[PDB]
Design a protein around this ligand. Structure first.
Ligand SMILES: O=C(O)CNC(=O)C(=O)O
Ligand SMILES: [Mg+2]
Ligand code: NI
Ligand SMILES: [Zn+2]
Length: 331
């Protein structure tokens, strides 16, 4: 068995190997990369996502989200308070202000210490989930707006044509902006490209040990667990590495820098934080190996998780028994 300790693997494809996206994912899996839940892909030195980032300031962040925490430093939830619209140029200036900027630090490990110690005492503002793309249309390799769609994968594997579309999303972050512990919708893959700015630190639990993380979360968030049998689908709960180590949960960590891709694998729980002003682009995707994970994915039916149009068909075809109850949650 390849990669039996489930370590995060890092890949350095040549320009030739960067042509065929599906083939390279399958290669990474042949080496055991999925066992970690997360992999890093450093693009060939010849590749670029676009020529410059000099003209992005007029993108609108229609609904910036202030991430307000409750709990203790290592075990907390966050809620998202909607703020007034602002442009990317306005948000970058805000991120760089004395109130929100990254503090002085020695290295990534010192910054990580400061994040876990102090996150809860501040409320950073995240421009998340903004439909669009920063890939130049002429970038032909690993262009997250030109991937094969999940609907076409389901049709190729299972023969059933379904409605729905699959487009990328932009994330504009600042110091302390936080992504809570989750897997993807329908336990899909995700791919995330850090276009510019400061790093993003990731934590991940191997897919084979995901249920250990779920059992800890039910113990640590006991009211949320009674409210919903899949409450991590709400994407609000944080648990620190120190707490995970104290409770024997297997995980790994890695820092992504500008110019790098990360891939999350089906049922790979992940969480993390931004180091400073940055912009990332991400999208879900599928491969043939996903189909069995899609069929087994948990679902929130309490009404909190509220998701895309396109998830309807995935539930309806892969999980017909759950469909009725899940759709009640969506309506
Ligand atoms: O970058 C973020 O805030 C969150 N991204 C992801 O969870 C991802 O790409 O799957
Ligand atoms: Mg612009
Ligand atoms: Ni994710
Ligand atoms: Zn729920």
């Amino acid at each position: 068995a390849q990669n039996p300790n489930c370590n995060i693997m890092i890949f350095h494809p040549t320009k030739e190997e960067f042509n065929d996206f599906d083939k390279y994912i399958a290669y990474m899996e042949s080496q055991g990369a999925h066992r970690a839940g997360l992999a890093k892909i450093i693009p060939p030195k010849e590749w670029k996502a676009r020529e410059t980032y000099d003209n992005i300031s007029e993108i609108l962040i229609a609904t910036p989200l202030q991430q307000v925490a409750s709990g203790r430093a290592g075990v907390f939830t966050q809620y998202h308070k909607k703020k007034k619209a602002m442009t990317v140029g306005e948000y970058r200036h805000l991120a760089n202000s004395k109130k929100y900027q990254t503090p002085p630090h020695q290295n990534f490990e010192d910054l990580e210490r400061k994040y876990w110690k102090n996150r809860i005492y501040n409320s950073p503002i995240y421009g998340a989930d903004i439909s669009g793309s920063l890939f130049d249309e002429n970038t032909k390799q690993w262009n997250l707006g030109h991937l094969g769609t999940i609907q076409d994968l389901l049709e190729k594997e299972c023969g059933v044509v379904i409605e729905g579309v699959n487009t990328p999303y932009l994330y504009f972050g600042m110091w302390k902006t936080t992504f809570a512990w989750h897997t993807e919708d329908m336990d899909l893959y995700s791919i995330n490209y850090l276009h510019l700015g400061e790093p993003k630190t990731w934590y991940v639990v191997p897919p084979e040990h995901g249920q250990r993380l779920e059992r800890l979360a039910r113990e640590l968030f006991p009211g949320s667990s009674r409210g919903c049998g899949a409450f991590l689908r709400h994407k609000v709960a944080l648990i620190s590495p120190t707490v995970l180590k104290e409770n024997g949960i297997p995980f790994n960590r890695i820092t992504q820098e500008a110019g790098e891709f990360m891939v999350t694998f089906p049922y790979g729980y992940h969480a993390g934080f931004n180091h400073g002003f940055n912009c990332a682009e991400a999208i879900n995707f599928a491969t043939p190996r996903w189909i069995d994970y899609g069929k087994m994915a948990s679902q929130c039916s309490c009404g909190e998780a509220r998701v895309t149009f396109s998830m309807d068909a995935f539930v309806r075809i892969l999980q017909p028994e759950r469909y009725d109850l899940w759709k009640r949650g969506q309506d």
